[PDB]
Specification:
2 copies of one chain form a homodimer. Chain A has 339 residues and is α/β, with parallel strands linked by helices. Helices cover 35% and strands 22% of the residues of chain A. The first copy, chain A, has 10 helices and 11 strands. In chain A, the strands form 2 sheets. A 9-stranded mixed sheet of chain A has the order 5-4-6-7-1-8-11-10-9, sandwiched between helices. Chain A: Keywords: Acyltransferase, Transferase.
Chain lengths: 339, 341
């Protein structure tokens, strides 16, 4: 039947406050106000696979699942993993699991974690003897290639790792539904070249805002806004229906750690929900963790006791492409590690 | 095993000869002689996703599978796809499929194609209504970030795309077995930092794999490294053959990675005692190493040129840094219409 969350965990490097970022010329007064961010997790020496491995160790310890029962390891990220022609998933496996199941990367930009979750679910269900799968995320968004404040204005990017242990056997939470929606007509929005033609040649800084204006120019603003809207609506409604629930049945909404303006436009003023019913306060101190926001968010809600037995949680995730994922998770019991 | 290959395709940019490489100083006489490479596919303008999409079109058209029946799109690669925070697999879906199933990237360095094949298989088997899945590969290995001749001496890297359509419903070949083996103890071989500690900080290029191998071996020991790599290969081969109820003698054609002659001799010819003539050696040496797409390219070559015949078993052999190994036994059921005699 259904699948469980058996464990989860994060590794978050020390927060850099918006005030420190203001002082350092990293962001201006206006972006501080438009996003309402308070802090962002920023790494010093730690690389992405390192942070993913650390998070996985926590998630595995809490899961009580033996390495021999981890049948798949999936590592998701959206930025450079540190070494080309190197297998970071294999690093995660060596360090946090030490078994010999297949280990590979799964990427879907800011939706990677949920994309990996989709494939993990499938892998587990594809054979009767499979027990658990480990999913991690990790990213390090440092100069010179990335500017966490302005590479994509309205979202502030974080360094860190997240991890989740999925199981067919049991756990403290139950995966009631998981739905992914794809709207590839939008792919050109995040690259150079003609939106409906081939991509421009390579581009390793990073400047999303320019590509989005070029896209809207060619496709039309009305078409663009409507497609994003429709894709978001289809994933929400799809996940809720699959779980037998409505938004009113949902106690907590895990939202992407985007800036306030984006969250209001996409969620608060659209679904008419209150920020206190979401992970808004957590996100604005944390920052966008690549494809791992929903994992960090759900971990937070559970670890802090904000989610109680019987209650439903809604994970909301979006990635350039576009792809949207939504999941409904039911908390069965408060894990040992919660407070 | 009950999955089928319904289609497959490649898009290879024009070949650059070893002679031209020699003349331009990319290749010395010793490297030409040890690898025995004739040519390598090199793109001019074409980007990785672009070549992936071109191969997918060919693969889908051949398969005759409708977009509505493509339930998953997986794009595999081992090098920079061209634009950060952009979805290459969404490009491939838009250009080549035009549908709305999930589209995502799967990577496992040079074993990427087979790694995506594992996940695609699982996905299809995970729900009764599912039909087909599209797997693509695409890379572009240009300077100054990468050196196709020198970055990993002994293997010459190609630009290009490949694609495969996997169906539960039917196709011209049957996937009889697919087996994946993992030795994460070797991950350190392809990066800086201590092989058994954390990675060194972000390498700002150019890719130098031999530097890392020497450092790994110096630390872990040559004896240990060679034996583990060998054991991994052996497990995948034996696992795949046994899962198919076959022995190596029952295999008509072996699709090998497109590595240099010296490496293929060491890994395969002098190890398994199989005839290079029975392998995709001649094809690979004109193509180069297509990231994680060689087993797709090689199988496509064997089928397209009629070198593989109904009832005959084919062995796919793939390996990537990590290490990860995949082998697969594919039974050809009928010559498709795009195939020569």
């Amino acid at each position: 039947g259904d699948l469980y969350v058996a464990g989860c965990g994060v590794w978050l490097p020390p927060p850099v406050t918006t005030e420190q970022a203001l002082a350092a010329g990293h962001c201006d007064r206006r972006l501080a106000s438009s996003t309402r961010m308070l802090s962002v997790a920023v790494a010093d020496k730690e690389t992405p696979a390192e942070m993913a491995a650390l998070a996985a160790q926590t998630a595995l310890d809490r899961s009580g699942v033996a390495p021999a029962h981890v049948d798949l390891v999936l590592h998701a990220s959206l930025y450079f993993q540190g070494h080309h022609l190197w297998a970071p998933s294999s690093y995660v496996q060596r360090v946090a699991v030490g078994n010999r199941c297949p280990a590979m990367e799964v990427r879907q930009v800011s939706n990677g974690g949920m994309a990996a979750l989709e494939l993990a679910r499938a892998y587990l269900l594809a054979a009767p003897d499979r027990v658990a799968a480990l999913i991690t995320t990790g990213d390090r968004m440092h100069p010179p290639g990335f500017d966490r404040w302005s590479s994509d204005p309205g979202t502030v990017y974080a360094d860190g790792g997240t991890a989740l242990v999925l199981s067919r056997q049991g756990g403290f939470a139950r995966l009631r539904s998981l739905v992914t929606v794809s709207e590839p007509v939008l792919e050109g929005m995040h690259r150079g070249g003609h939106p409906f033609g081939p991509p421009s040649p390579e581009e390793q800084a990073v400047d999303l805002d320019a590509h989005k204006r070029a896209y809207v120019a060619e496709a039309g603003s009305s078409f663009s806004v409507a497609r994003v809207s429709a894709g978001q609506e289809e994933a929400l409604t799809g996940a809720l229906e699959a779980a037998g629930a409505g938004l009113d049945d949902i106690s907590r909404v895990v939202l992407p750690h985007m800036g306030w303006r984006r969250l209001s436009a996409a969620y608060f003023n659209k679904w008419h929900i209150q920020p206190e019913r979401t992970t808004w306060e957590f996100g604005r101190r944390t920052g966008h963790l690549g494809g791992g926001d929903p994992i960090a968010g759900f971990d937070h809600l559970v670890g802090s006791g904000r989610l109680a037995p019987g209650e439903l949680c809604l994970l909301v995730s979006v990635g350039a492409g576009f792809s949207w994922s939504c999941a409904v998770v039911e908390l069965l019991e408060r894990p040992s590690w919660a407070a």
